[PDB]
Design a protein around this ligand. Structure first.
Ligand SMILES: Nc1ncnc2c1ncn2[C@@H]1O[C@H](COP(=O)(O)OP(=O)(O)OP(=O)(O)O)[C@@H](O)[C@H]1O
Length: 417
RNA sequence: GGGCCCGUAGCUUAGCCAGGUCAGAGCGCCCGGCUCAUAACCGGGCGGUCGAGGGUUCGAAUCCCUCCGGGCCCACCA
């Protein structure tokens, strides 16, 4: 007997199925034909800016205890040769079978696949250092996510109960009783979180894709996911599995503290002062700029962000903030932001008398219409509405890796349920 | 004492000095849609009679008179 970590990635299709699903099918075969599957499988989300991602850049791995690693590999290669969309060109699968003892040695790699950008060669190099049995299909871009999935270190993590439909019910649209999910959220939240967007009315955990996935509930315990699991009404649940994921951890973010430049296709946490004030563009798309330890940084607050814009617009030149987000097209697409300090803002106004006064020459104060005389203008402090604290985008906007403010222990949280 | 600017839906604005689809548009808002691929025109709807008053004309947001409100400049007196 031996302990081997199986890792899989890039196997789905635009029109195809899910990668967690194929890992479940392989698991079943391992469980009854080769040995046992130890504990909960793992869904490790990686760099959410990769262009190759089919929709979320999620990779899968699971511990196994088989008698002979050779058969194991064949068995898994098979499940791929049958349930993997090898047809598409956006799908280049890869599988890894690393010995448990060796998993740890991959934390640096997985880490680099989550926060930065890697290359197929880099994955093949790791494989080459420990002669890790692997499966490279076509290009094999999957070997990246595969290794990562196994090496990814979870110091923090959330759980996710994923239920799949019956095969015949595929393609067709899912049938379910919405209202049951709110009863569910209204009864288990925060425990189970990011499952519904009230102030935007939506059920996020229920996809609308070709994927076998019926629904997918996130929580902080099996207890919650369990209570939730039965406390909901939907079509009959065929297969179902609970995954340990780095979902809602911010494992992708890079503190400014730890780097010099800021490259595109990466995410960070920065502090800065609004140099240029907020502003829209067709579609409800808000933008602004902050002065940073790097220079002039621009922040995007796209429409899908909803109620977030209602806060961002309130930002004024000179405010101190902390922006969390990924950078693409040289901009930081806000996922959440902290309002550290607010800059007061005054206004110049011409005096009165009867009524208001005008300007009498460049250096000659102001005179009435009311025939009077005054020297200075009416300066006034304009109280703001915006307030310091942490503001995040709404549930329906959340990105898998994005840590919801409900999980963070910081004061000044304005939570959007 | 004189000389200018500017005011079109809640904002920001086309059109205005070539007056005859008297009202276009982006944001907002109301209402939907997409998606648990951070996402640079996703939609529909309501919404202005064009600062106020007045005059010319077959007719003005659109040319003229003046007023309200914003705001500016040059001189003079001292
Ligand atoms: N940091 C990275 N650098 C380079 N390539 C990466 C990186 N992270 C992931 N990849 C590659 O991006 C591709 C993602 O494809 P994949 O099909 O896994 O998307 P998915 O969104 O995970 O699919 P699904 O969510 O439907 O199961 C894989 O080849 C993965 O190896």
């Amino acid at each position: 007997h031996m302990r081997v970590w199986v890792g899989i990635d890039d196997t789905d299709s635009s029109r195809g199925m899910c990668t967690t699903y194929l890992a479940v099918l392989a698991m079943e075969r391992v469980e009854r034909e080769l040995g046992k599957v130890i504990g909960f499988p793992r869904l490790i989300r990686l760099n959410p800016t990769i262009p190759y991602k089919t929709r979320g850049n999620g990779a899968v791995s699971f511990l196994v205890e088989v008698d002979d690693v050779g058969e194991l590999v064949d068995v898994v290669n098979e499940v791929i040769i049958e349930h993997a969309m090898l047809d598409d060109e956006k799908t280049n699968p890869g599988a890894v079978f690393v010995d448990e003892e060796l998993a740890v040695k991959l934390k640096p790699f997985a880490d680099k696949a989550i926060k930065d950008v890697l290359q197929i060669d880099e994955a093949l190099f790791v494989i080459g250092k420990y002669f890790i049995p692997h499966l490279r299909h076509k290009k094999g871009r999957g070997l990246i996510g595969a290794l990562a999935a196994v090496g990814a270190e979870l110091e923090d993590f959330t759980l996710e109960l994923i239920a799949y439909r019956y095969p015949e019910r595929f393609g067709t649209e899912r049938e379910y009783d919405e209202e049951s999910f709110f009863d569910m959220d209204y009864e288990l939240y925060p425990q189970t979180f990011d499952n519904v967007d009230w102030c935007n009315d939506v059920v996020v955990c229920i996809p609308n894709t070709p994927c076998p996935v019926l629904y997918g509930i996130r929580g902080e315990s099996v207890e919650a996911l369990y209570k939730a699991m039965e406390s909901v009404k939907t079509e009959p649940v065929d297969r179902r599995m609970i995954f340990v994921t780095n979902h809602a951890t911010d494992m992708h973010l890079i503190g400014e503290e730890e780097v010099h430049r800021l490259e595109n296709y990466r995410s960070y946490r920065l502090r800065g002062r609004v140099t240029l004030e907020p502003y829209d563009i067709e579609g409800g798309h808000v933008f602004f700029e902050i002065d940073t330890k790097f220079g002039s940084v621009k922040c995007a607050a796209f429409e899908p962000t909803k109620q977030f814009r209602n806060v961002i617009r309130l930002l004024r030149k000179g405010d101190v903030v902390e922006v969390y987000g990924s950078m693409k097209k040289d901009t930081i697409n806000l996922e959440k932001i902290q309002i550290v300090e607010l800059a007061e803002i005054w206004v110049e106004k011409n005096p009165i008398c009867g009524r208001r006064m005008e300007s009498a020459g460049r250096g000659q104060g102001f005179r009435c219409k009311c025939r009077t005389k005054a020297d200075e203008k009416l300066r006034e402090k304009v109280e703001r509405e915006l307030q310091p604290g942490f503001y995040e985008v709404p549930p329906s906007a959340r990105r898998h890796l994005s840590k919801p403010l409900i999980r963070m222990n910081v004061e000044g949280r304005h939570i959007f349920r």
